[PDB]
A paper describes a structure:
These sites donate electrons to the O2 reduction site that comprises two high potential metal sites (heme a3 (Fea3) and CuB).
Effects of decreasing the azide concentration on the X-ray structure of the azide derivatives were analyzed for investigation of the mechanism of the two-step binding of azide to CcO revealed by spectroscopic analyses. The terminal binding of two azide ions simultaneously to Fea3 and CuB was observed also at 2 mm azide and the occupancies of the two terminally-bound azide ions are identical to each other irrespective of the azide concentration down to concentrations that are insufficient to saturate the two terminal binding sites.
Author numbering:
A (entry chain F): 1 to 98
B (entry chain M): 1 to 43
C (entry chain B): 1 to 227
D (entry chain E): 5 to 109
E (entry chain D): 4 to 147
F (entry chain L): 2 to 47
G (entry chain I): 1 to 73
H (entry chain J): 1 to 58
């Protein structure tokens, strides 16, 4: 009616697919599939922006449903603010030798 | 926008040469065909 | 016919063409006025150093931008569609004439009573008689009775053509295998000219139409003499 | 939104924040000049005193130039605003763009 | 001072009457006397000279408003050069008439046109407004 | 990798402006001349 | 000396827009009045005056005498 | 049949810098050269056929 | 319809195999019978050289130019009628 | 009723610009009529209206080709 | 310091305008172009028949 | 090193060889129709076939062997296949429009009737109904294959996919036999034109769909599919349902209603 | 390395550059064909030959300008360079298939130039109507080569449309909804849906024409019960969506250019602009028989197509008034791209308004197949699609190349082109109202004055096209490298520098949900 013989993804996925599947099982998102959830964005509680290099582009949708996104480079160091709404972001570099 | 000064400035005389060559590149071959249309038409 | 430096339509020879001219005047003013209004705001938006660059609320002004155009379109479409259904109204023709397009000339058949038909070709420029019009005269004109509603049926024996007479507001495509009908009524005697209006090959520019509108009794004797 | 007085009072308060930082001074002025208005003297006074707390003389001068610029062809507005600010200009030692020759093309 | 292509991702200076306080100072590196001037700026501004005040402005910004908004003579070059090249176009048209186009048809000869004009009036071309309406059939001349 | 930056992200060289002028004259001039030579060809056949 | 008066400082772009969108409309109404008058009304009256006493047989006889027709000499 | 996908995964992930369409080895180069030769040779032949067809024949 | 069969619960290979062998392949076997019954030799109609049929505006690019691609001599006349 | 035939009148069955089926239908009606009349001994003069109408509307080449096809036995309408 | 427009702008405007008018008037009037203007108020009609 | 989930594809010669194969096929058809020669056309068909084979081979290398089809890449390929099928639906709609235009207003040349005078349609209850049962049955078996694969059952996936292909081949052999048996041809006016061009393009798509199912069959034999990742199979199934639906519209429109 | 990079590309910027170079070369072919048309018509009589060589030139003029210059530049060139950058994506969804959409175009253009070289060319009109395009009135290979050119261009664009739709739906940052994508990305998504649905119907129609010409089908031949008018419906069911495909990416570039040089962070009324483009795309599929008002359709069909064609003015008007509302209050920067966009707003509005005249079928009886239609569509194409292309090319040339143009020469170029195109096309309205037909190699003498002026205008536009080539040469010859660009917070495609590296967004942007 039924038997086996078909590999599973656990058995046979490879390469990036396998990395994404193993990371997800750990609740981790090294390949940026999910949208990060904002913090309150104050200077004490900045949005923490991970990166593998010294700077990353941020898009800030300052209020819900704005159609305009405000884009800027966030660099390693002191938190920076969105130039439209002032909400704070801080770069958290490093790894993928992760 | 802002930009650096030219790395290889094109002086007025060089612009006149590039502009003349560019216009002749379009005008001479077409001008040659149209000048000779009667030649192509009456055999 | 058209005359040199002409800007608008040929004067109307039929009441339908008159209606089209007034409907065009109505529409063109609107075209004027909108094109002028646009250019004038444009120029108002571009001629002040005052600024306001923060986010602007769109909803109120979009109501005006949709509703006033919609009203303008209804003010064009109402007279437009009155004319369309007027031209389609039943009228009772007194005569039917067919024209067949060919490469490159028209034939005409008037077979209500007798089997009258003939071909109509452009007069070559080197054979024009003095005073005749280059590319527009034909050897055998389409003689027709003035002040009478005539049914013209149009078809083709080869590729598409299109039978047009601008001063009567007429253009009906000539399609092989199809018989298209239009109505013609000239308010005046005279010579009314048109030109083939669908690309049809090497001499598309050189197969014109010339209607000759005369009193019925002259049309009758002409018809008899053409048998 | 609010009355004109409430709008003005929110901006006066923004600039009067004692420990306003340089980023906030710039954000405030670059936001304010997006509006359809020339800021009232009392807003400009509070921005000029924020420049003083931030030891930034040049930005005080630039704010006076952007008041003139926002008035467009209404050439009566800037002299009126400089008139109303004269006590604060004298108290803080702020020279106007014209006194500095910075109105010359 | 000098801006570099490899600085493209860093905050940059801009003279924009709509963005009066840009994100960085026009000059960040200071000489010994420029450092001393920024220290003096911490004290009362009434003690700064007019030249010190202008120096502080030109460290912070590049051009003033009057300078960045100045008008220019560029319109004369644009309109003059566009007229030149439109004039150059008429040389091409002169060349095409001379070497490309042959004679136009004989229906444009003056006598043909006078006869054709009479025949258009005899068949009352455009008699309501366009053409024959402009002829006076009673006086046998063009309407004044 | 491949070259990056101004003048290097294009399939033609801009290292010499006169060799460039020649290449641009050949490229845009051949497109503009083609229809005249096709007309010449259609006239010369019949 | 005299102090200067306080001028209006707010809404100057909106005020200018208000004033001119009105002038643009008032003008569209004035141009429509000239347009009806100089082109459309003029046409109607040219056609009505042409046909009011028009005699199509007299027009035909004129044309016929001028030699323009194939079917009528 | 036996599942030999792991062997192919090791082959195609070998760190040899080869693009994927030549990574299976020498037979890929051969098939690529055949395909590209027939395409380029056919394209020249098509141009020849245009030259021929562009003129009337006796 | 619900059609006339009836089962669900969250879905399955066993059911789709049951539909393939118990409904789909039987229907093909029945239609294959029905077609077998009505197969072979119908009686070709008189040839009539109708002008809307057997169109030839350009010869076909194979054969002698006058035969259609899957020409069946028994039932496809040429423009001049059935072949020998 | 109708002598002083001038042309084919308006026919509510064919009120649109495409009048091809008006021509075809009258040609069929005429010839169907004439076959019925020539058969049953009666008079083709009764078919006259269809004859005038199709002669008025139909292009001469369409009538000529349909007549050749009726003679050839390849006319595809039912008469 | 004066740029290209301050130094050459007046002469480009004057010379381009002068040149443009001169060559278009010459082209329009001196080389045999047939503009075919209206006969109205221009042509004396002549017997044709 | 990227930190998004998308696939940066290695530079490839197949787009160019595919474009050239299209130049060779079309200039080849022009040579065949006008200059009596098949040479360019067979060179183009051969290079089109080589291109298709190496390009899809490389997509299998990239996915099954190299792991670049993360879920975000697979979701793209889902949308791509759906959009491709929609374009093919609109291509068939043009032929359906032509069929209904000519059959709803049959011209005098046809006899003013549909089917035209002189046309003797096939009986839709004979081989056409058989073909309908065949493609419907194959949509049932292709669904059994899909559920077997999701349930991890190799033998029954292969058995059901082989049945599906066998029925695709049955329909194609039955259609070829019907084309040879039919007493009307593509030259038999607009009836033959609509009939053979609309069913002929449908037959080509049944051949393309069957080839795609055979590719999936050999990949399944080589264990490429997992019980959760097998988009080639899904795409071939969606294409196969499209070929069945188009057939049902042809059967109702041309064979049944147009008889 | 050169062959791997430029013939085997899988990179959206380099493929975009290939499309812009192809489109520029096609634009010179199409300009030369446009000058041969106006040389034939610039004095009365015959210059070249009869209407066959003339209408081979007119036919090729249209196909070159539409399929080899506008579509490759707007969708293949600006779409590929800008869409992935505007959404932070690392490339297109199918970067290898994207390169085949590009490489199908040289062969499609080769087929079209072969059609003109063999026999007597395809002198059919770009509509390719039968029976003039059938195998009795156009015997021999020319029209088949044209059909095959169109099949290759159609496959290229259908596969491009699948690529763009998939990329725009699937490859945005996970926080970005489709209501946070820029207007030019929406304009390319909607154009791609129009291409996906319309091109297959043209492919069906031209394939039917190919089988009537070569396999003895009779879809359009009444002798077999076919109908020439069925081809017209199938052609124009694609042909009306095609003109909205030509202009929509233009509208997306105009929205960016107007917003940028008004010093605004956003266009006025963004959701109205999305609604207007979706409405114009939807209505553009239900109006096609406005190209057929003289073929003999019933009066009620003619009433419905008049009304439905006019309705498109409502959403089109919303976009025009919203570009004026975006200028309102702007800090206006009179750059040469802004001049192009302002020329576009006014000249597109004139041509849309003469489109509304033509929508009235009773007036279209007299205007159809005359130069009034030629004037309508050249104000929306030569003064709308071309001016959006030139605005986007001068705005984004420093992004693509890293070098700046000379803005004074670019303004001179805009001035000459604006005079030229208006001299060329404005008098064609008078020629159309007074009755001059389309597709004529010569005209009755009365039409001479306006044809002479229109031809003089066309030479002014030729001077502008020549100068454009010199201006591009001068920028590459001087190499003034870009330093800072304004407004990058609301123009993401600039934020990677000029030109951006070969791989961008290898680390995607960070966008939170909030
Ligand atoms: C980019 C190309 C383009 C575009 C955008 C358009 C837009 C439109 N066109 Fe055009 N058209 C063509 C290219 C284009 N056209 C071409 C190439 C042909 C000829 C095909 C051939 O035969 O070869 C053609 C032909 C064509 C015809 C057939 C004419 C005939 O052959 O007899 C018609 C008929 O309706 C038509 C109408 C319209 C209309 C109503 C629009 C509308 O979409 C325009 C809407 C825009 C506006 C109306 C302006 C902005 C609005 C405002 C400022 C609001 C206020 C306005 C109002 C109240 C009205 N066009
Ligand atoms: C089981 C069905 C599969 C078909 C097998 C036959 C071979 C052709 C393959 C492709 C089929 C597709 C349709 C193409 C058009 C015509 C073929 C129609 C189907 C067919 O095979 O029709 C046959 C005729 O074929 C003829 O003329 C044949 C002429 C063969 C040349 C084909 C022409 C080239 C086609 C151009 C295609 C253009 C592609 C468009 C791409 C669109 C881009 C977006 C019918 O035979 P008959 O003897 O007339 O009548 C039966 C009498 N006993
Ligand atoms: C064929 C049909 C043609 C139809 C044409 C019809 C044209 C419509 C006319 C528009 C008038 C209605 C809008 C009036 C505003 C004008 C611009 C302006 O006025 O700039 C500002 C208004 O903008 C605000 O806020 C509100 C939000 C921003 C402004 C919204 C402006 C609308 C855009 C104007 C569009 C111009 C282009 C029109 C195109 C035809 C003025 O600021 P306020 O004093 O209000 O606030 C200041 C805040 N305080 C009071 C708290 C201190
Ligand atoms: C008669 C000959 C002339 C006509 C030419 C066509 C001939 C036959 C072609 C048959 C089509 C074969 C397509 C084979 C595709 C194999 C590649 C494939 O299926 O690739 C899959 C991706 O899908 C993909 O790209 C999906 C790719 C699908 C595209 C194919 C659909 C048909 C294209 C046909 C051309 C249509 C012509 C239309 C004519 C008008 C790979 O991903 P998975 O399967 O998830 O595997 C990974 C797992 O192993 C990980 O665990
Ligand atoms: C629509 C696009 C083109 C529009 C306008 C072109 C403007 C013309 C540029 C000049 O073209 C040249 O003109 C010469 C004449 O001035 C031609 O020489 C011809 O005439 C000379 C003088 O008679 C002889 O010396 C030459 O041998 C003979 O080739 C020459 O061949 C042709 O290249
Ligand atoms: Cu007959 Cu054009
Ligand atoms: Cu349209
Ligand atoms: Mg037409
Ligand atoms: Na001419
Ligand atoms: Zn923000």
């Amino acid at each position: 009616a039924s038997g086996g013989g078909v590999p599973t993804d656990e058995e046979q996925a490879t390469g990036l697919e396998r990395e994404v599947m193993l990371a997800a099982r750990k609740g981790q998102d090294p390949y940026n599939i999910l949208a990060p959830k904002a913090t309150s964005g104050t200077k004490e509680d900045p949005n923490l922006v991970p990166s593998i290099t010294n700077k990353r582009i941020v898009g800030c949708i300052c209020e819900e449903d704005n159609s305009t996104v405000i884009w800027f480079w966030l660099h390693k160091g002191e938190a920076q603010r969105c130039p439209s709404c002032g909400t704070h972001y801080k770069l958290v570099p490093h790894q993928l030798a992760h | 926008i802002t930009a650096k000064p030219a790395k290889t400035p094109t002086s007025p005389k060089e612009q006149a040469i590039g502009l003349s060559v560019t216009f002749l590149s379009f005008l001479l071959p077409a001008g040659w065909v149209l000048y000779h249309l009667d030649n192509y038409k009456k055999s | 016919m058209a005359y040199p430096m002409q800007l608008g339509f040929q004067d109307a020879t039929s009441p339908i063409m008159e209606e089209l001219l007034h409907f065009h005047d109505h529409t063109l003013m609107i075209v004027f006025l909108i094109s002028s209004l646009v250019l004038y705001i444009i120029s108002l938006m571009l001629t002040t150093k005052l600024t306001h660059t923060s986010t602007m609320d769109a909803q109120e002004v979009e109501t005006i931008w949709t509703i006033l155009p919609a009203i303008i379109l209804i003010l064009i479409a109402l007279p437009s569609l009155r004319i369309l259904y007027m031209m389609d109204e039943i009228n009772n023709p007194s005569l039917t004439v067919k024209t067949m397009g060919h490469q490159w000339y028209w034939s005409y058949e008037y077979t209500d009573y007798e089997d009258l038909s003939f071909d109509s070709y452009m007069i070559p420029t080197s054979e024009l008689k003095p005073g005749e019009l280059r590319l527009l005269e034909v050897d055998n004109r389409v003689v027709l009775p003035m002040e009478m509603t005539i049914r013209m049926l149009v078809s083709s024996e080869d590729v598409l053509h299109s039978w047009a007479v601008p001063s009567l507001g007429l253009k009906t495509d000539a399609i092989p295998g199809r018989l298209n009908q239009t109505t013609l009524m000239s308010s005046r005697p005279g010579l009314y000219y048109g030109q083939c209006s669908e690309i049809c090959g090497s001499n598309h520019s050189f197969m014109p139409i010339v209607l000759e509108l005369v009193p019925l009794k002259y049309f009758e004797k002409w018809s008899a003499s053409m048998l | 939104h609010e009355t004109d007085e409430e709008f003005d009072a929110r901006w006066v308060t923004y600039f009067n924040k004692p420990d306003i930082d340089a980023w906030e001074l710039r954000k405030g002025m670059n936001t304010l000049v997006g509006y359809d208005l020339v800021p009232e003297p009392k807003i400009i006074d509070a921005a000029l005193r924020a420049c003083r707390r931030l030891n930034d003389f040049a930005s005080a001068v630039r704010i006076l130039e952007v008041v003139k610029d926002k008035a467009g062809p209404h050439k009566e507005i800037y002299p009126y605003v400089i008139q109303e600010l004269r006590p604060t200009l004298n108290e803080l030692g702020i020279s106007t763009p014209e006194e500095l020759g910075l109105d010359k093309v | 001072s000098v801006v570099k292509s490899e600085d493209y991702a860093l905050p940059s200076y801009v003279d924009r009457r709509d963005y009066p306080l840009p994100d960085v100072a026009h000059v960040k590196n200071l000489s010994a006397s420029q450092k001393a001037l920024k220290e003096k700026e911490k004290a009362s501004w009434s003690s700064l000279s007019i030249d010190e005040k202008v120096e502080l402005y030109r460290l912070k910004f590049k051009e003033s408003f009057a300078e960045m908004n100045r008008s220019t003579n560029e319109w004369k070059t644009v309109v003059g050069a566009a007229m030149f090249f439109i004039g150059f176009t008429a040389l091409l048209l002169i060349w095409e008439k001379h070497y490309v186009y042959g004679p136009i048809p004989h229906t444009f000869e003056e006598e043909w046109v006078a006869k054709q004009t009479k025949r258009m009036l005899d068949m009352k071309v455009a008699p309501i407004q366009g053409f024959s309406a402009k002829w006076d059939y009673d006086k046998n001349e063009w309407k004044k | 990798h491949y070259e990056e930056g101004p003048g290097k992200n294009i399939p033609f060289s801009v290292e010499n402006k006169w060799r460039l002028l020649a290449m641009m004259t050949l490229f845009f001039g051949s497109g503009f001349a083609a229809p005249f030579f096709i007309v010449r060809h259609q006239l010369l056949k019949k | 000396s005299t102090a200067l008066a306080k001028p209006q400082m707010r809404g100057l772009l909106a005020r200018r827009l208000r004033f001119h969108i009105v002038g643009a409309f008032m003008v569209s109404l004035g141009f429509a009045t000239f347009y009806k008058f100089a082109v459309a009304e003029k046409r109607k009256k040219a056609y009505a005056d042409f046909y009011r006493n028009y005699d199509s047989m007299k027009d035909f006889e004129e044309m016929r005498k001028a030699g323009i027709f194939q079917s009528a000499k | 049949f036996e599942n030999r996908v792991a062997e192919k995964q090791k082959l195609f992930q070998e760190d040899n810098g080869l693009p994927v369409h030549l990574k299976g080895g020498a037979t890929d180069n051969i098939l690529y050269r055949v395909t590209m030769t027939l395409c380029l040779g056919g394209t020249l032949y098509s141009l020849y056929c245009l030259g021929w067809a562009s003129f009337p024949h006796k | 319809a619900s059609a006339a069969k009836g089962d669900h619960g969250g879905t399955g290979a066993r059911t789709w195999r049951f539909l393939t062998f118990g409904l789909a392949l039987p229907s093909v076997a029945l239609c294959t019978l029905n077609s077998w019954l009505h197969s072979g030799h119908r009686e070709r109609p008189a040839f009539i050289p109708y002008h809307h049929l057997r169109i030839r505006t350009k010869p076909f690019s194979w054969g002698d130019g006058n035969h259609t691609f899957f020409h069946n001599p028994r039932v496809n006349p040429l423009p001049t009628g059935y072949e020998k | 009723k109708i002598k002083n035939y001038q042309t084919a009148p308006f026919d509510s069955r064919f009120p649109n610009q495409n009048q091809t089926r008006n021509c075809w239908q009258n040609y069929l009606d005429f010839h169907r009529c004439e076959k019925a009349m020539t058969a049953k001994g009666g008079d083709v003069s009764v078919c006259e209206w269809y004859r005038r109408v199709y002669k008025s509307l139909c292009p001469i080449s369409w009538v000529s080709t349909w007549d050749d096809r009726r003679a050839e036995g390849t006319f595809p309408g039912k008469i | 310091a004066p740029d290209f427009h301050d130094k050459y702008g007046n002469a480009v405007l004057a010379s381009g305008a002068t040149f443009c008018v001169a060559v278009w008037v010459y082209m329009a009037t001196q080389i045999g172009i047939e503009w075919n203007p209206s006969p109205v108020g221009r042509v004396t009609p002549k017997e044709w028949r | 090193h990227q930190t998004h989930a998308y696939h940066m594809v290695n530079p490839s010669p197949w787009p160019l060889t595919g474009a050239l194969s299209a130049l060779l096929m079309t200039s080849g058809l022009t040579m065949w129709f006008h200059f009596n020669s098949m040479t360019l056309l067979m060179i183009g068909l051969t290079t089109n076939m080589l291109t298709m084979y190496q390009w899809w081979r490389d997509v299998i290398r990239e996915s099954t062997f190299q792991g670049h089809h993360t879920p975000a890449v697979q979701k793209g390929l889902r949308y791509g296949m759906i959009l491709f099928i929609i374009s093919e639906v609109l291509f068939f709609t043009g032929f359906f429009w032509a069929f209904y235009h000519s059959s709803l207003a049959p011209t005098p040349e046809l006899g003013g009737c549909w089917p035209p005078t002189g046309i003797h349609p096939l009986n839709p209850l004979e081989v056409p109904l058989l073909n309908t049962s065949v493609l419907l049955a194959s949509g049932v078996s292709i669904t059994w294959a899909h559920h077997s694969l999701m349930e991890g059952d190799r033998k029954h996936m292969l058995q059901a996919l082989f049945i599906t292909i066998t029925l695709g081949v049955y329909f194609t052999l039955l259609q070829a036999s019907e084309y040879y048996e039919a007493p009307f041809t593509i030259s038999d006016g607009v009836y033959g034109s609509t009939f053979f061009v609309a069913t002929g393009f449908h037959g080509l798509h049944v051949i393309i769909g069957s080839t795609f199912l055979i590719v999936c069959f050999f990949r399944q034999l080589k264990f490429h599919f997992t019980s959760n990742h097998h988009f080639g199979f899904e795409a071939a199934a969606w294409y196969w349902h499209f070929v069945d639906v188009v057939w049902l519209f042809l059967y109702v429109s041309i064979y049944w209603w147009g008889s | 390395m050169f062959i791997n990079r430029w013939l085997f590309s899988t990179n959206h910027k380099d493929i975009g550059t290939l499309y812009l170079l192809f489109g520029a070369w096609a634009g010179m072919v199409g300009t030369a064909l446009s000058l041969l048309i106006r040389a034939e018509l610039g004095q009365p009589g015959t210059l070249l030959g009869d209407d066959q060589i003339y209408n081979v030139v007119v036919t090729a003029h249209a196909f070159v300008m539409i399929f080899f210059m506008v579509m490759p530049i707007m969708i293949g060139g600006f779409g590929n360079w800008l869409v992935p950058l505007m959404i932070g994506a690392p490339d297109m969804a199918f970067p290898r298939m994207n390169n085949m959409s590009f490489w199908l175009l040289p062969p499609s253009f080769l087929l079209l130039l072969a059609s003109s070289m063999v026999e007597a060319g395809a002198g059919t009109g770009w509509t390719v109507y039968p029976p003039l395009a059938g195998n009795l009135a156009h015997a021999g290979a020319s029209v088949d080569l044209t059909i095959f050119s169109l099949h290759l261009a159609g496959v290229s664009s259908i596969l491009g449309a699948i690529n763009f739709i998939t990329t725009i739906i699937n490859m945005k940052p996970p926080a970005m909804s489709q209501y946070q994508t820029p207007l030019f990305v929406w304009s390319v998504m909607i154009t791609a849906v129009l291409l996906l649905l319309s091109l297959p119907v043209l492919a069906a129609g031209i394939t039917m024409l190919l089988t009537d010409r070569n396999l003895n089908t009779t879809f359009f031949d009444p002798a077999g019960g076919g109908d020439p008018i069925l081809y017209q419906h199938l052609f124009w069911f694609f042909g009306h969506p095609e003109v909205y495909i030509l202009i929509l990416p233009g509208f997306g570039m105009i929205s960016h250019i107007v917003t940028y040089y008004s010093g605004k962070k956003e266009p006025f009324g963004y959701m109205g602009m999305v609604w207007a483009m979706m409405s114009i795309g939807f209505l553009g599929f239900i109006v096609w028989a406005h190209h057929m008002f003289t073929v003999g359709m019933d009066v009620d069909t003619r009433a419905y197509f008049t009304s439905a064609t006019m309705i498109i003015a409502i959403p089109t008007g919303v976009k025009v008034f919203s570009w004026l509302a975006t200028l309102h209050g702007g800090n206006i920067k009179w750059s040469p791209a802004m001049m192009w966009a302002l020329g576009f707003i006014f000249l597109f509005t004139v041509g849309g308004l003469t489109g509304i005249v033509l929508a009235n079928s009773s007036l279209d009886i007299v205007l159809h197949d005359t130069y009034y239609v030629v004037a309508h569509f050249h104000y929306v194409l030569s003064m709308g699609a071309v001016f959006a292309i030139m605005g986007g090319f001068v705005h984004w040339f420093p992004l693509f190349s890293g070098y700046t143009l000379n803005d004074t020469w670019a303004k001179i170029h805009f001035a000459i082109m604006f005079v030229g195109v208006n001299m060329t096309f404005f008098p064609q309205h008078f020629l159309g109202l007074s009755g001059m037909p389309r597709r004529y190699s010569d005209y009755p003498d009365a039409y001479t004055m306006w044809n002479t002026i229109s031809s003089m205008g066309s030479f002014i536009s030729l001077t502008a096209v020549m100068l454009m080539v010199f201006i591009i040469w001068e920028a590459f010859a001087s190499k003034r490298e870009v330093l800072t660009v304004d407004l990058t917070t609301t123009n993401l495609e600039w934020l990677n520098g000029c030109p951006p590296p070969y791989h961008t967004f290898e680390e995607p942007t960070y966008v939170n949900l909030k």
